[PDB]
Amino acid sequence: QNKCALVTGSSRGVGKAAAIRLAENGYNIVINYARSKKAALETAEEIEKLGVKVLVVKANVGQPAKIKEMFQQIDETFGRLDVFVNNAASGVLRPVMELEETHWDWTMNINAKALLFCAQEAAKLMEKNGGGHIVSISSLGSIRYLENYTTVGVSKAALEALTRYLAVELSPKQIIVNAVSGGAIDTDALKHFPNREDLLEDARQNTPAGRMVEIKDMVDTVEFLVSSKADMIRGQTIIVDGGRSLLVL
Amino acid sequence: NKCALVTGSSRGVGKAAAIRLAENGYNIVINYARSKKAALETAEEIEKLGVKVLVVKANVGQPAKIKEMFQQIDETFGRLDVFVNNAASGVLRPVMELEETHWDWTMNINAKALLFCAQEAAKLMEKNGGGHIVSISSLGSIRYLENYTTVGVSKAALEALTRYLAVELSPKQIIVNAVSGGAIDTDALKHFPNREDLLEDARQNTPAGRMVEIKDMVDTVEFLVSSKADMIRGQTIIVDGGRSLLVL
Amino acid sequence: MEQNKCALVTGSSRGVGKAAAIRLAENGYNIVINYARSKKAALETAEEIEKLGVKVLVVKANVGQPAKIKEMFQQIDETFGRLDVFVNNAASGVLRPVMELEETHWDWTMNINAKALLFCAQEAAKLMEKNGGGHIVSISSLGSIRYLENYTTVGVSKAALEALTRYLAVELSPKQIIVNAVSGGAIDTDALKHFPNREDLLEDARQNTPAGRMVEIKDMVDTVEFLVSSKADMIRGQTIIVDGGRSLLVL
Amino acid sequence: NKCALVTGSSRGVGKAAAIRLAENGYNIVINYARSKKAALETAEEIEKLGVKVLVVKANVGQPAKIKEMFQQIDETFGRLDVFVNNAASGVLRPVMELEETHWDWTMNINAKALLFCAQEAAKLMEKNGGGHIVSISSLGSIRYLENYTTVGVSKAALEALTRYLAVELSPKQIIVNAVSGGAIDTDALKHFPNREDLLEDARQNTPAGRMVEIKDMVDTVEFLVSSKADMIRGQTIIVDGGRSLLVL
Ligand SMILES: NC(=O)C1=CN([C@@H]2O[C@H](COP(=O)(O)OP(=O)(O)OC[C@H]3O[C@@H](n4cnc5c(N)ncnc54)[C@H](OP(=O)(O)O)[C@@H]3O)[C@@H](O)[C@H]2O)C=CC1
Ligand SMILES: NC(=O)C1=CN([C@@H]2O[C@H](COP(=O)(O)OP(=O)(O)OC[C@H]3O[C@@H](n4cnc5c(N)ncnc54)[C@H](OP(=O)(O)O)[C@@H]3O)[C@@H](O)[C@H]2O)C=CC1
Ligand SMILES: NC(=O)C1=CN([C@@H]2O[C@H](COP(=O)(O)OP(=O)(O)OC[C@H]3O[C@@H](n4cnc5c(N)ncnc54)[C@H](OP(=O)(O)O)[C@@H]3O)[C@@H](O)[C@H]2O)C=CC1
Ligand SMILES: NC(=O)C1=CN([C@@H]2O[C@H](COP(=O)(O)OP(=O)(O)OC[C@H]3O[C@@H](n4cnc5c(N)ncnc54)[C@H](OP(=O)(O)O)[C@@H]3O)[C@@H](O)[C@H]2O)C=CC1
Ligand SMILES: Oc1cc(Cl)ccc1Oc1ccc(Cl)cc1Cl
Ligand SMILES: Oc1cc(Cl)ccc1Oc1ccc(Cl)cc1Cl
Ligand SMILES: Oc1cc(Cl)ccc1Oc1ccc(Cl)cc1Cl
Ligand SMILES: Oc1cc(Cl)ccc1Oc1ccc(Cl)cc1Cl
């Protein structure tokens, strides 16, 4: 058969566009979501027009038992997996002094713990045909301060560190692991930020490139990192931000 | 007089940090999870230096135990000036063998602890116009150490939390940083199946020509809480004899 | 002015630069080959590229001299009338212990490895404006940010090269010029013969790279090709490390 | 009595560092290129602290003048324990306006100088048990500062040379590191056509709620030469009030 790709959180936004790009390149697709079922089924219908097979799996990736159920479905339906894009994220955006334990656990479980358990199940499927590629999506708040972003920034720093440990430990399985970090993108996720207009204004005005990052720019780097043209890039996080992080003022 | 808490100060780096702060006149809170005998021995040594000591058993992996410990500090000393986040644990095995409990145990003790300890520290620090927070990290936050995934991932989280705390606690005049060490010959190395490899690497490959010692880590902590480092914020200072520079 | 896009690669008579130029030619770019002394190698290279059905200009220019750079870009404007891609690849160096370094060793290395990018980028930007933009990619190594034995002159020059990459990436952005770099681990090429510890570098790369093999010229060229492709237009002032995971390790 | 050299110590950070070391008991070598009166005033101030001072005119962009200066230090004091590479100059212009003379000027003074000065320092230090070398850098080494290309590129070269020197001088018992600052309101800042924007950005956006002062740079230099920083090697410590953490 043909190669298969899973993209977590692919009902909308970056994940959806990544799943479509992989489908355009001949991959069968696993679409994943937590609650936005209608958008997930609509994405699946769009992608099936390309002549690939699509499996839609509801699985909150913050719960390893749901991860394991999802991968059992992938194994039953396709019997293989070749590309895995860890893209889903959630979070609680408030000042650090107001954070509660549930806010930390929710965010860390979905955004960083997910990669460890998805990577384990992905590797077991990838070993069947000789390897594969894993790419995670991160942001500038892993290494810099974004206002109100503590829970998510800390999870993304864990995610990038996990990307390094997996990149070393899964190399014997011929699995290539890396991450792509973005500057701000005008998706539904920005609506979580009470300072949404400030972020957009800053991206529009202060990005050296002269425009904001778009979903296509993140997808283009994902595509490269799964393409076989990037097999000796390992454990790296590539920053796609139009040059915004280079500045001071 | 000012008061300092060091989590995990029954032995190793934390014990030495607490002793150094006592030598500097700070009253001390010693904290442990199970090593009570060692914690009381440490408290006895520190009272010889002429400061007061409070010993608190509190597993920092549990926010409720954290809150209890800072309630005792408020009742005993009524203030806090220095907080060193030093306690760590972990499960050291290959990534494919890790289970959810191994992740939760490690992330709760090593990284979640700083969040809840920092919130409680800040509440006490702002009573007297501020304070300093320093956390202890290692080269595995940014590089690969064998079987160290749970711990390395938690130290990367801790350094990122250090950056977020350093910005958001600045209005309270609290100065927050971290110190990352190369390998040190403490009881922690007993957790590693490759202990002898780590020591031999540190001995032979460190440019300085010797291993990092506890004293080197404490020297940087002492600098970071001294008032001479108040415009260093959110930084992780690497103390490794130059080991991480090499790319053999 | 040429109808098809045109690319310059400095130091393209052999090694990574030669391979990058052949790759760009395979993708339809007309090519400027550049060398300082290896004229025969540069001419054989151009002959292989002409068989791909693109035009090739061969220019001798020591890129450690800004005057020779200006002459080179004057030849490119005269022959092709445009430049769309510029890959700053040439390097030289003096490999010895830091205590044995003399001023001439520093000047030679900095001039060819780092100063070259500034003046080549200025001249490239002037040509790139004829068609509204372009891409500049420089080649660096792990010695920019780490210690590599005997590599002080070159490592310091590559750190300068990577900082110049960031400054150019910001300041050339209004001209729609995208500037980045690619940093490699060790590759079995003619350049390893410059190292008195060549065997130790090879043993290390072969034994300690997580990928289980050494970087090859092809892996460098694959990244170059991506960074000039239009798929990387919002990557700016970054250095992408291509080392099989080697730099991740400690022990 | 140990001896310390600080390049460019007629005014600004270099002057304050020389004063601080003199307060700590070091004999001092003051260095300048053109500000003779200022250098002489500085020496007079320092002589009042009870230490010996040597004033040496040497343009550090010229390795022959560097060699001459260290011969004078050897003859006068017979030793050197601390060397602070602080002198800098530059040409602040957009990248398209830069000429080869602007590059050579800036690179010779800011980066070439550390190589040759560290070579001569090491020959003196290794004769007497070793020493410390600290260079001063800025955020422009790793970030973009407007018009700062020549200086930012030279400072990236300086931080790389700091790494290479840290490794290769370790067998001589010489500890080499760097300190990178945010903006400071010194005479150097008047070379910037956007000085007012740098000052406003530093005052408004630094999380600490104030600008870095000369004293904060000096405090870190003092640490990095002190014995308490002997296992910090080839690191650049950022002193910027947390400014570099932000995006916006
Ligand atoms: N937008 C931006 O500016 C930037 C985004 N990022 C990263 O890009 C990635 C995608 O974000 P973006 O596309 O903007 O966000 P969107 O809100 O558009 O999409 C998020 C996707 O994640 C899914 N998801 C959320 N939680 C879970 C969960 N527990 N389990 C399974 N799926 C889940 C959502 O599905 P559902 O509705 O069912 O929850 C949705 O499909 C994230 O990792 C984000 O951190 C990085 C840099 C910048
Ligand atoms: N040793 C090394 O090579 C290096 C260590 N580090 C870091 O240094 C720090 C100290 O390690 P080190 O001194 O070597 O180790 P030690 O084993 O000597 O000391 C660990 C201390 O932490 C305490 N501790 C462990 N878990 C908890 C918990 N849940 N709650 C409260 N206290 C706890 C221990 O007490 P108890 O016995 O009661 O559990 C002990 O007092 C750690 O953060 C480690 O990550 C960093 C780099 C290198
Ligand atoms: N080989 C490796 O392990 C690695 C190499 N790199 C980098 O890759 C790049 C290419 O190296 P590599 O292909 O291995 O080296 P090679 O020796 O194979 O080729 C070097 C090329 O540079 C040219 N060159 C040297 N000096 C000048 C000059 N002054 N003016 C114009 N051309 C000049 C040479 O031509 P001529 O003979 O006429 O002088 C030759 O064409 C360099 O930037 C290097 O730092 C990076 C990481 C690893
Ligand atoms: N001010 C700031 O915001 C920041 C400064 N820095 C760094 O701090 C260091 C000191 O700068 P700062 O104190 O602000 O500047 P000042 O202008 O106050 O002092 C500069 C000193 O350098 C000397 N100097 C300049 N060129 C030479 C030369 N060729 N040979 C010998 N001495 C020379 C000057 O003496 P003379 O008059 O005789 O030439 C003078 O004593 C520099 O490395 C700078 O890059 C870093 C971050 C921020
Ligand atoms: O990580 C991100 C970073 C930025 Cl700058 C913008 C959006 C991002 O993505 C998220 C942020 C918060 C939540 Cl609740 C969910 C998502 Cl997807
Ligand atoms: O973090 C560390 C890094 C290193 Cl190189 C050596 C020891 C370390 O500390 C620990 C490692 C594992 C566990 Cl279980 C507990 C501790 Cl205190
Ligand atoms: O930069 C490099 C880094 C490595 Cl690991 C290997 C080779 C390199 O390339 C050079 C090294 C020295 C000189 Cl003189 C010339 C060149 Cl092309
Ligand atoms: O390096 C610096 C960085 C900053 Cl933010 C401010 C001043 C600096 O120092 C200089 C900058 C330019 C010149 Cl001509 C001379 C010097 Cl001393």
Instruction: Count the residues in chain B.
Output: 248
Verify whether residue C147 is a known catalytic residue: no
The pair phi, psi for residue C81, each rounded to 5°, is 75, 15
Structure tokens at D103: 């590059």
3-state secondary structure of C215: strand
Structure tokens at A199: 């972020």
Interface mutation target, options D232, D237, D246, chain B, most CBs of B under 10 Å: D232
List, in order, residues 6 or more apart from C230 with CB less than 8 Å away.
Answer: none
DSSP C21: H
How far is CA A95 from each of CA A92, A102, B143, rounded to the nearest angstrom?
10, 15, 30
Residues with a CB atom less than 6 Å from ligand 7: C 91-93, 141, 143, 154, 186, 191-192, 194
Residue type, C58: V
- Is D185 annotated among the ligand-binding residues? yes
Residue whose entry in the numeric block shows the structure tokens 């991506």: C226
How far is CA A239 from each of CA A183, C105, D165, rounded to the nearest angstrom?
8, 35, 30
B136 CB less than 6 Å from ligand 2?
yes
CB contact under 8 A, A243 and C173: yes
Look at residues C18, C26, C158 and name the one whose alpha carbon lies nearest to residue C91: C158
Question: How many whole angstroms separate alpha carbon C7 and alpha carbon C120?
Answer: 13
- Asked if C211 and C219 touch (Cβ cutoff 8 Å), the reply is no
- Asked if C21 and C9 touch (Cβ cutoff 8 Å), the reply is yes
DSSP C184: E
Q: Which atom of ligand 6 is nearest to the CA of B106?
A: 14
Structure tokens at A97: 């002094």
Strands B131-138, B82-85: pairing kind: parallel
Crossing angle of helices C15-26 and C217-227, in 10° steps, is 50
β-bridge mates for residue A149, sequence order: none
| Dist. CA B191 → ligand 2 center (Å) | 11
How far is CA A234 from each of CA A225, A238, B151, C146, rounded to the nearest angstrom?
10, 11, 20, 17
Checking phi first, is residue A243 left (phi over 0); if not, alpha (psi -120 to 50) or beta? Answer: left
Checking phi first, is residue A248 left (phi over 0); if not, alpha (psi -120 to 50) or beta? Answer: alpha
Question: How many whole angstroms separate alpha carbon C110 and alpha carbon C112?
Answer: 6
β-bridge mates for residue C82, sequence order: none
Angle at CA of residue D210, ends D206 and D213, nearest 5°? 110
- Asked if B59 and B35 touch (Cβ cutoff 8 Å), the reply is no
Burial of D93 (0-12, 13-18, 19+ CB in 10 A): middle
Instruction: Give the end-to-end CA distance of chain B in Å, rounded to a whole number.
Output: 49
The answer to whether B229 contacts chain C (CB < 8 Å) is: no
Residue whose entry in the numeric block shows the structure tokens 């990236």: D156
Chain C environment of B200 (Cβ under 8 Å): none
Residue whose entry in the numeric block shows the structure tokens 């080549």: C120
Angle at CA of residue D160, ends D155 and D165, nearest 5°? 120
Residues B13-28 as b/e (b if ≥16 CB within 10 A, e otherwise) read bbbbbbbbbbeeebbb
Tell me how crowded residue C96 is: count the other CB atoms within 10 A of its CB: 15
CB contact under 8 A, D95 and C166: no
CB contact under 8 A, C147 and D164: yes
3-state secondary structure of C27: coil
Question: How many whole angstroms separate alpha carbon B149 and alpha carbon B95?
Answer: 7
Question: How many whole angstroms separate alpha carbon C167 and alpha carbon D150?
Answer: 9
Quote the radius of gyration of chain D (alpha carbons, Å): 17
Question: How many whole angstroms separate alpha carbon B175 and alpha carbon B167?
Answer: 9
Q: What resolution in angstrom units was achieved for this structure?
A: 1.8
CB contact under 8 A, A217 and C226: no
Tell me how crowded residue D35 is: count the other CB atoms within 10 A of its CB: 17
| Residue C2 CA, distance from chain mean position | 24
A11 CB less than 6 Å from ligand 5?
no
Structure tokens at D222: 């003092």
β-bridge mates for residue D238, sequence order: D180
DSSP of chain A: ---EEEESS-SSHHHHHHHHHHHHTT-EEEEEESS-HHHHHHHHHHHHTTT--EEEEE--TT-HHHHHHHHHHHHHHTS---EEEE-------S-GGG--HHHHHHHHIIIIIHHHHHHHHHHHHHGGGT-EEEEEEEEGGGTSB-TT-HHHHHHHHHHHHHHHHHHHHTGGGTEEEEEEEE--B-SGGGGG-TTHHHHHHHHHHH-TTSS-B-HHHHHHHHHHHTSSTTTT--S-EEEESTTGGGB--
Tell me how crowded residue A174 is: count the other CB atoms within 10 A of its CB: 16
HSE (side-chain half, CA atoms, 13 Å) at A215: 17
Identify how the structure was determined: X-ray
DSSP of C112-179: IIIIHHHHHHHHHHHHHGGGT-EEEEEEEEGGGTSB-TT-HHHHHHHHHHHHHHHHHHHHTGGGTEEE
Burial of C126 (0-12, 13-18, 19+ CB in 10 A): middle
Residue type, A61: V
Residue whose entry in the numeric block shows the structure tokens 């980066």: D111
The answer to whether D200 contacts chain A (CB < 8 Å) is: no
SS (HEC) of chain B:
CCEEEECCCCCHHHHHHHHHHHHCCCEEEEEECCCHHHHHHHHHHHHCCCCCEEEEECCCCCHHHHHHHHHHHHHHCCCCCEEEECCCCCCCCCHHHCCHHHHHHHHHHHHHHHHHHHHHHHHHHHHHCCEEEEEEEEHHHCCECCCCHHHHHHHHHHHHHHHHHHHHCHHHCEEEEEEEECCCCCHHHHHCCCHHHHHHHHHHHCCCCCCCCHHHHHHHHHHHCCCCCCCCCCCEEEECCCHHHECC
Burial of D80 (0-12, 13-18, 19+ CB in 10 A): buried
Question: How many whole angstroms separate alpha carbon C131 and alpha carbon C137?
Answer: 18
Q: Which of C246, C247, C251 sits opposite B198 (nearest CB)?
A: C251
Question: How many whole angstroms separate alpha carbon C178 and alpha carbon C241?
Answer: 18
List, in order, residues 6 or more apart from C100 with CB less than 8 Å away.
Answer: none
- Asked if C237 and D152 touch (Cβ cutoff 8 Å), the reply is no
Strands C239-242, D3-6: pairing kind: unpaired
Structure tokens at A200: 């957009």
Question: How many whole angstroms separate alpha carbon A41 and alpha carbon A81?
Answer: 21
Question: How many whole angstroms separate alpha carbon B241 and alpha carbon D234?
Answer: 9
CB contact under 8 A, A221 and C215: no
Question: How many whole angstroms separate alpha carbon B3 and alpha carbon B69?
Answer: 14
Handedness of CA D39, D45, D48, D49 (dihedral sign): negative
The answer to whether D221 contacts chain B (CB < 8 Å) is: no
- Asked if A117 and B100 touch (Cβ cutoff 8 Å), the reply is yes
**Closest chain C residue to B197, measured at CA:** C251
Name the helix (H) or strand (E) containing C240: strand C239-242
DSSP C20: H
Tell me how crowded residue B123 is: count the other CB atoms within 10 A of its CB: 14
Strands C56-60, C85-88: pairing kind: unpaired
Question: How many whole angstroms separate alpha carbon D157 and alpha carbon C156?
Answer: 5
3-state secondary structure of C231: coil
The pair phi, psi for residue C187, each rounded to 5°, is -130, 140
| Dist. CA B213 → ligand 6 center (Å) | 14
Question: How many whole angstroms separate alpha carbon D246 and alpha carbon B210?
Answer: 37
The answer to whether A195 contacts chain C (CB < 8 Å) is: no
Question: How many whole angstroms separate alpha carbon D237 and alpha carbon D182?
Answer: 11
Look at residues D148, D161, D120 and name the one whose alpha carbon lies nearest to residue D5: D120
How far is CA C175 from each of CA A107, B234, C132, C135, C230, rounded to the nearest angstrom?
41, 36, 7, 11, 15
β-bridge mates for residue A55, sequence order: A30
Chain C environment of A168 (Cβ under 8 Å): 210, 245, 248-249
Look at residues C96, B21, C241 and name the one whose alpha carbon lies nearest to residue D164: C96
β-bridge mates for residue C9, sequence order: C33, C87
Domains in chain D, start-ordered, CATH in brackets?
Answer: 1-248 (3.40.50.720)
Handedness of CA A222, A185, A143, D211 (dihedral sign): positive
Strands D53-57, C239-242: pairing kind: unpaired
D135 CB less than 6 Å from ligand 4?
no
List, in order, residues 6 or more apart from B205 with CB less than 8 Å away.
Answer: B243, B246, B248
| Residue C103 CA, distance from chain mean position | 24
CB contact under 8 A, D205 and A249: yes
- Asked if D85 and D136 touch (Cβ cutoff 8 Å), the reply is yes
* The A54-58 sheet, strands edge to edge: A54-58, A28-33, A4-7, A83-86, A132-139, A175-182, A237-240
How many B-D residue pairs are in contact by the CB < 8 A criterion? 93
Verify whether residue A149 is a known catalytic residue: yes
Residues B218-242 as b/e (b if ≥16 CB within 10 A, e otherwise) read bbbbbbbbeebbbbbbbbbbbbbbb
**Max CA separation in chain A (angstroms):** 54
Question: How many whole angstroms separate alpha carbon B19 and alpha carbon B13?
Answer: 10
The dihedral formed by the CA atoms of D4, D8, D10 and D16, expressed in degrees to the nearest 10: -60
Residue whose entry in the numeric block shows the structure tokens 């590129």: D153
The answer to whether B145 contacts chain C (CB < 8 Å) is: yes
Chain A environment of D139 (Cβ under 8 Å): 248
Question: How many whole angstroms separate alpha carbon C18 and alpha carbon C46?
Answer: 9
C65 CB less than 6 Å from ligand 3?
no
3-state secondary structure of C9: strand
- Asked if D121 and D80 touch (Cβ cutoff 8 Å), the reply is yes
- Is A13 annotated among the ligand-binding residues? yes
Question: How many whole angstroms separate alpha carbon B226 and alpha carbon D23?
Answer: 18
Question: How many whole angstroms separate alpha carbon C213 and alpha carbon C215?
Answer: 7
Q: Which of B163, B166, B237 sits opposite D232 (nearest CB)?
A: B237
Burial of D190 (0-12, 13-18, 19+ CB in 10 A): exposed
The pair phi, psi for residue B132, each rounded to 5°, is -130, 140
Catalytic option among C5, C35, C115, C151: C151
SS (HEC) of A173-195:
HCEEEEEEEECCECCHHHHHCCC
Question: How many whole angstroms separate alpha carbon D233 and alpha carbon D176?
Answer: 6
List, in order, residues 6 or more apart from C68 with CB less than 8 Å away.
Answer: C61, C62
SS (HEC) of chain D:
CCEEEECCCCCHHHHHHHHHHHHCCCEEEEEECCCHHHHHHHHHHHHCCCCCEEEEECCCCCHHHHHHHHHHHHHHHCCCCEEEECCCCCCCCCHHHCCHHHHHHHHHHHHHHHHHHHHHHHHHHHHCCCEEEEEEEEHHHCCECCCCHHHHHHHHHHHHHHHHHHHHCHHHCEEEEEEEECCCCCHHHHHCCCHHHHHHHHHHHCCCCCCCCHHHHHHHHHHHCCCCCCCCCCCEEEECCCHHHECC
DSSP C245: T
- Asked if D113 and D87 touch (Cβ cutoff 8 Å), the reply is yes
Structure tokens at B6: 């060091």
The dihedral formed by the CA atoms of A42, A47, A53 and A56, expressed in degrees to the nearest 10: -30
Chain B environment of D132 (Cβ under 8 Å): none
- Asked if D189 and D199 touch (Cβ cutoff 8 Å), the reply is yes
Name the helix (H) or strand (E) containing C42: helix C39-50
The answer to whether A210 contacts chain C (CB < 8 Å) is: yes
DSSP of C46-110: HHHHHTTT--EEEEE--TTSHHHHHHHHHHHHHHTS---EEEE-------S-GGG--HHHHHHHH
DSSP C17: H
* The B27-32 sheet, strands edge to edge: B53-57, B27-32, B3-6, B82-85, B131-138, B174-181, B236-239
List, in order, residues 6 or more apart from A95 with CB less than 8 Å away.
Answer: A148, A150, B168
Catalytic option among C158, C175, C193, C231: C158
List, in order, residues 6 or more apart from C98 with CB less than 8 Å away.
Answer: C152, D115, D118, D119, D164, D165, D168, D169
**What subunits touch chain A, counting only 3 or more CB pairs under 8 A?**
B, C, D
Structure tokens at D6: 């600080």
Residue type, B213: E
3-state secondary structure of C223: helix
Chain D environment of C144 (Cβ under 8 Å): 160
HSE (side-chain half, CA atoms, 13 Å) at C147: 27
Quote the radius of gyration of chain A (alpha carbons, Å): 17
